[PDB]
Ligand code: HEC
């Protein structure tokens with residue numbers, strides 16, 4: 001699986017730039033928060049774990065997770081590993 | 087159906103403020119573009135009609151439409167009529 005392609009095509013980049021906080025936190029910031037926590041990042045992406053980066057705006061991000069409900073666990077992992085690479 | 091509640095809960099407001107263009111066009115701008123074109127706005131929301139407001143960023147908005155695939159046509163109309171009210 002291609003985490004970069006999934007990220008692109010689900011429209012995530014609109015709120016998540018690599019190195020700058022905008023509507024959502026940067027990928028760099030998310031990657032740092034979830035360093036060594038890949039399993040938890042996958043859980044988050046499933047709606048299974050709490051926001052740990054910007055809880056003030058948790059409810060804004062939550063609905064975006066609905067996009068990901070067609071992905072396998074391997075694809076979710078690939079998406080997580082793309083995020084973590086930043 | 088409650089178009090305002092649908093808008094809120096699908097997370098649309100993150101990119102669409104009432105009166106200011108941000109990541110996406112303002113609701114006011116969209117409402118003006120689709121004045122007298124409710125049917126076309128509903129088609130757009132279904133993935134059925136082209137972007138007429140900001141075609142440069144059509145591909146950014148498109149994936150957001152996937153959220154709306156659980157809505158009835160009446161609910162899509164309510165969402166359209168909430169947008170149009172601006
Ligand atoms: C409409 C803007 C928007 C879009 C589009 C968006 N996000 Fe977010 N995202 C946010 C906001 C706001 C936050 C901060 C709230 C939070 O931390 O949960 C956030 C936070 C996150 C976080 C950190 C969660 C945490 O632990 O705090 C991850 C991971 C994430 N988004 C992934 C994604 C992915 C993957 C996509 C594409 C499926 C996506 N986002 C699309 C707005 C967006």
Ligand code: HEC
Nearest residue numbers: 014096098101109110137138139140141143144146147150
């Ligand atoms: C990640 C930011 C983002 C989110 C969240 C978002 N949009 Fe958009 N939207 C855009 C962008 C960028 C445009 C400009 C491209 C375009 O006009 O299609 C746009 C344009 C539109 C338009 C005008 C389409 C046209 O004819 O040009 C409508 C209607 C719209 N969005 C409705 C919605 C609704 C309803 C939701 C919630 C289900 C939503 N948007 C969520 C970014 C977003």
